[PDB]
Amino acid sequence: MKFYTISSKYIEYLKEFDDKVPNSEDPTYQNPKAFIGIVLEIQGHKYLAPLTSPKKWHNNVKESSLSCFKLHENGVPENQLGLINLKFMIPIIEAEVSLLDLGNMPNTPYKRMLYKQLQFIRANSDKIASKSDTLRNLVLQGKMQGTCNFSLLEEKYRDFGK
Template sequence: MKWYALDKEYVNYLKQFDSIVPNIEYTGKLKCFLGIVFKSNDDISYFAPLTSYKPKFKTLKNDIDFFKIIGENNKIYGAIALNNMIPVPESEYKEVTKENLATLRQFENKRELRNYWKLLEKELKYIDQTFILNSAEKLFQFVENNPNSNLAQRCCDFQLLEEKCKEYTKMISTKSFQELEYDEIEEDCDEINI
């Protein structure tokens, strides 16, 4: 598993249909997503948001929809909110690396950048990947089979978001094709001096 940055325009598109979809930017601070946590039957990849530490995490237990990132000396670094996992087409995510982090998020200085990268590495090290993968799949199945349950009510609407993910992919392909077609017409006109 790795950290990923999701396209803001795509996530805002999803937010139109489901208010539970998480914000991905807070005053220039990008939210990282863990991925790929699950692949649906339609081979759509799901990503789950990293959530910063909050004092209430001390009383919460790891569950099918929530995983605390706990390091040495039981220090809680943050959490993975599986209830907020979202489907993302391949064109709308990219891996967060040490080299591209500064282009994805604002930092006051290089020290802040280095410290944040170290934190991301540390958090990834403490994530139980098997637990995340198993929980994401179980959660998806549970919500699909029990859409009116309390658990489903605090989760993103996975089925709806998958439909919107597919629509977005078609919309982007159509737009790209139309742009390509326009560029080719423009080139043809240039060649015949129109």
């Protein structure tokens, strides 16, 4: 798994079908909204899932929740690092997506945080792929709401631009 960004035009396109697809453009954003890399690959679809910085309501989400994978520094549980917002993962196409360039990124606190996350994610990368698969299944069966319409997105995301 790796960090990605997603072209604004592609986010805009999907937003047309499901208004829950994560926002890309925002003036509060210091860095681009970062997505986490191939969280689930099934039936030809590859999903990326948006990372999100900590909010107040995060304390209430259970570790067992299918909607989020809470992130923290390896072996320092009190160093919370936001969460992978699985409920808003989206299918992608290689063309409209590009890896963060960690190689050439100047050393900033942000880059340092990126690496604390990368390690925790890599370490728990089976759990994360397993939550995703289950979350998708429940949504497709109608048992869960509040998420991206996977069934719909999976039907339209390959058209673009026609």
